[PDB]
């Protein structure tokens, strides 16, 4: 009990984390809650923004968690890959082309991939008839029955399997995926609050 408290107390100081949008909304809060419980003496600083923003501000952070590609001159730990699903009301299989497509703001390489897939699979020109700034707005539009969309798996929690059909997105019989990486200077692992965070996040 003395040594348990000793270790808990021991890990302290500050950790600054930069995290991309989707994971920041869905998984980070849970991780941070667990991290505060296990390591109450460390002060957290967090930014959640687009991958591009976080990568631009890399000097602000001990650790970055981003969707896209590895960051050069840093260690990169692969956390997971995400598949993507075309989602539409189950009751409406046939006339999917007539429903508005809901587009959320994201990396332009990603959007152009989605557009391509739409062209080739609905055999009709892609048009974002509903365009939104925030992913949760996209999800709310979907859930309320207003349209169809494509979401990565991480955003698909609490979407009724009873109400909606899910079609895995593939381009030239290759699943559209995005990888998420945790990136840091390896020497930052000598800080115990950072080492602790990195192993906790990687264990999810």
Query: What is the contact surface with Cl ion in residues (CB under 5 A)?
Result: 20, 22-23, 67
Residue 23 binding result from a copy of itself, Cl ion, none, given CB thresholds of 5 to 8 Å by partner type: Cl ion
Least distance to a copy of itself from the beta carbon of 44, Å? 6
Instruction: Answer yes or no whether residue 53 interacts with a copy of itself by CB under 8 A.
Output: yes
Least distance to Cl ion from the beta carbon of 154, Å? 7
* Cα gap 147→130, rounded to integer Å: 8
Q: What is the 3-state secondary structure (H, E, C) of the chain?
A: CHHHHHHHHHCCEEEEEEEEHHHHHHCHHHHHHHHHHHCCCEEEEEEEECHHHHHHCHHHCCEEEEECCCCCCCEEEEEEEECEEEEEEHHHCCCHHHCCEEEECCCHHHHHHHHHHHHHHCCCCCCEEEEECCHHHHHHHHHCCCCEEEEEHHHCCCCCCCCEEEEECEECCEECCEEEEEEECHHHHHCHHHHHHHHHHHHC
Residue 113 binding result from Cl ion, a copy of itself, none, given CB thresholds of 5 to 8 Å by partner type: none
Residue 139 in 3-state DSSP?
Answer: helix
Least distance to Cl ion from the beta carbon of 24, Å? 7
Residue ranges in 91-120 that form contacts with a copy of itself under rule CB under 8 A: 100
Q: Which stretch binds a copy of itself (CB under 8 A): 81-89, 114-122, 128-136, 156-164?
A: 128-136
Instruction: Answer yes or no whether residue 129 interacts with a copy of itself by CB under 8 A.
Output: yes
99/110 with CB nearer Cl ion: 110
Q: Which stretch binds a copy of itself (CB under 8 A): 39-47, 108-116, 169-177, 182-190?
A: 39-47
Binding residues for a copy of itself, rule: CB under 8 A, are 21, 24-26, 28-30, 32-33, 36, 43-50, 53, 100, 129-137, 140-141, 143-146
């Amino acid at each position: 009990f003395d040594k348990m408290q000793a270790h808990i107390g021991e890990v302290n100081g500050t950790i600054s984390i930069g995290c991309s949008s989707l994971i920041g909304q869905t998984l980070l809060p849970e991780v941070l809650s667990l991290y505060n419980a296990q390591f109450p003496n460390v002060e957290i600083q967090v930014q959640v923004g687009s991958t591009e923003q976080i990568k631009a501000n890399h000097r602000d952070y001990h650790v970055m968690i981003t969707r896209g590609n590895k960051v050069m001159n840093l260690a990169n730990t692969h956390l997971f890959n995400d598949d993507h699903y075309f989602i539409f009301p189950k009751n409406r299989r046939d006339d999917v082309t007539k429903l508005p497509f809901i587009e959320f703001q994201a990396d332009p390489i990603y959007i152009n991939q989605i557009k391509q897939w739409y062209n080739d699979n609905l055999e009709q020109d892609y048009h974002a008839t509903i365009t939104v700034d925030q992913v949760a707005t996209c999800k709310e539009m979907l859930i309320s029955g207003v349209g169809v969309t494509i979401l990565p798996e991480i955003m698909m929690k609490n979407i009724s399997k009873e109400q909606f059909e899910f079609e895995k997105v593939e381009i030239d019989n290759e699943p559209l995926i995005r990888s998420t990486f945790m990136s840091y200077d390896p020497s930052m692992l000598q800080l115990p609050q950072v080492d602790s965070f990195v192993n906790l996040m990687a264990s999810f």
